[PDB]
């Protein structure tokens, strides 16, 4: 049972963007808070598109996953609005918005440690889900939200959260799934109901690619037919210049689901990259 928030206690402000079958708005919620004090809080209002109301059950059940879990890297739910004929979730408003937009705007000022920190934080969230045997199913840079920017005055890192997964791929049309290549793994295009924990390891690889590519969208130049063919031909994404991160991307985007690495191993690989290696590559041989 979601906490029910009266529409009279919600003010809908600017559009903040859109997801699959959804639109998001910035809102203000009026509530009685701790100590009976009336407060106003910024909120995210996520509205299921009128043209997609048949997915309402999957829309709410996906958000309920994050009501049952509490973790510092997971977006908070506040409740649902009794907004008449509208299916509307009231969630935490993350100040700096989605990571894909942020990476694109700030691609000049983001260094490798920033990227490693964000990737390690996402891997920490995903290890928590893995340990709970829960499948997200929609890991992408758009669904990663930036709580706080890096503070170069102190060395403090950025801080991210992962959003709820939205409507499950298990109910989505094939045409939608094809457009979601290469986030949706190859085995889930024809049979999305076969998704498993290995699904999220593939998508994590794609998301790490996004992080390393300044918010480019992989394979955006390929139409749906050519995206399908990319999987038929067993291609990998183009390597970022950071070779060790290219290796991790590709290890996660293994066409064999059972060979994709655990999130514990992913975290280990990321952690190792924080320590500089000043020995020239290939020094085991003398010329
Ligand atoms: N929680 C949650 N806060 C937020 N803040 C947010 C979103 C957009 C902006 C801002 C904040 C302000 C910053 C602005 N910049 C621009 C440059 C300077 C300032 C950018 C605008 N966005 N956001 C969320 C976002 C999504 C899903 N969920 N939440 C989502 C999850 C699953 C399925 C579908 C969706 C819907 C779309 C993605």
Q: How far is CA 29 from the centre of its chain?
A: 25
Contact 167, 55 (CB under 8 A): yes
Helices and strands: H and E segment counts in the chain: 9, 8
For residue 207 the two structure tokens come to: 């998301």
Asked if the bond preceding 182 is cis, omega within 30° of 0, the reply is yes
Establish whether residue 19 lines the binding site of ligand 1, counting it when its CB lies within 6 angstroms of any ligand atom.
Answer: yes
Ligand 1 atom index nearest CA of 93: 3
Give me ligand 1 centre to Cα 21, in Å.
Answer: 15
Q: How many angstroms separate the CA atoms of 191 and 177, rounded?
A: 10
88's CB contacts (< 8 A; 6+ apart) are 45, 46, 47, 48, 80, 81
Q: How many angstroms separate the CA atoms of 145 and 148, rounded?
A: 9
For residue 159 the two structure tokens come to: 């801080």
Name the experimental technique.
X-ray
DSSP string, 190-259: H-GGG--HHHHHHHHHHHHHHHHTTT--TTTTS-HHHHHHHHHTT--PPPPSSHHHHHHHHHHS-SSGGG
Q: How many angstroms separate the CA atoms of 107 and 56, rounded?
A: 36
Helix locations, the chain, DSSP H:
56-68, 99-105, 112-131, 174-179, 187-190, 197-212, 224-232, 243-252, 263-273
For residue 51 the two structure tokens come to: 């043209």
Establish whether residue 96 lines the binding site of ligand 1, counting it when its CB lies within 6 angstroms of any ligand atom.
Answer: yes
Give me ligand 1 centre to Cα 94, in Å.
Answer: 7
3-state secondary structure of 40: strand
Q: Whose CA is nearest to atom 5 of ligand 1?
A: 97
For residue 147 the two structure tokens come to: 């709580």
Query: Domains (ranges, CATH) in the chain?
Result: 4-92 (3.30.200.20), 97-274 (1.10.510.10)
Q: How many angstroms separate the CA atoms of 77 and 155, rounded?
A: 30
3-state secondary structure of 26: strand
7's CB contacts (< 8 A; 6+ apart) are 81, 82, 83, 84
3-state secondary structure of 122: helix
Q: How many angstroms separate the CA atoms of 44 and 18, rounded?
A: 12
């Amino acid at each position: 049972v979601f906490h029910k928030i009266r529409n009279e206690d919600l003010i809908f402000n600017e559009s903040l963007g859109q997801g699959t079958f959804t639109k998001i708005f910035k809102g203000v919620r009026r509530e009685v808070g701790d100590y009976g004090q009336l407060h106003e809080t910024e909120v995210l209002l996520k509205v299921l598109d009128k043209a997609h109301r048949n997915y309402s059950e999957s829309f709410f059940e996906a958000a309920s996953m994050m009501s049952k879990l509490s973790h510092k890297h997971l977006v908070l739910n506040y409740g649902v609005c009794v907004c008449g004929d509208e299916n509307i979730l009231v969630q935490e408003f993350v100040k700096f918005g989605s990571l894909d937009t942020y990476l694109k705007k700030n691609k000049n000022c983001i260094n490798i440690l920033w990227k490693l920190e964000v990737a390690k934080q996402l891997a920490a969230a995903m290890h928590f889900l893995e340990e709970n045997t829960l499948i997200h199913g929609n890991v992408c840079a758009k669904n990663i939200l930036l709580i706080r920017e890096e503070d170069r005055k102190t060395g403090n890192p950025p801080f991210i959260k992962l959003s709820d997964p939205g409507i499950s791929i298990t109910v989505l049309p094939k045409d939608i799934l094809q457009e979601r290549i290469p986030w949706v793994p190859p085995e889930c295009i024809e049979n999305p109901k076969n998704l498993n924990l290995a699904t999220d390891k593939w998508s994590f690889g794609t998301t790490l690619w996004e992080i390393c590519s300044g918010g480019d969208k992989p394979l955006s130049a390929l139409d749906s037919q050519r995206k399908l063919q990319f999987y038929e031909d067993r291609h990998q994404l183009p390597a970022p210049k950071a070779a060790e991160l290219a290796n991790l991307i590709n290890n996660c985007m293994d066409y064999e689901p059972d060979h994709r690495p655990s999130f514990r191993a992913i975290i280990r690989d990321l952690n190792s990259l924080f320590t500089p290696d000043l020995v020239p590559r290939g020094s085991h041989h003398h010329h």
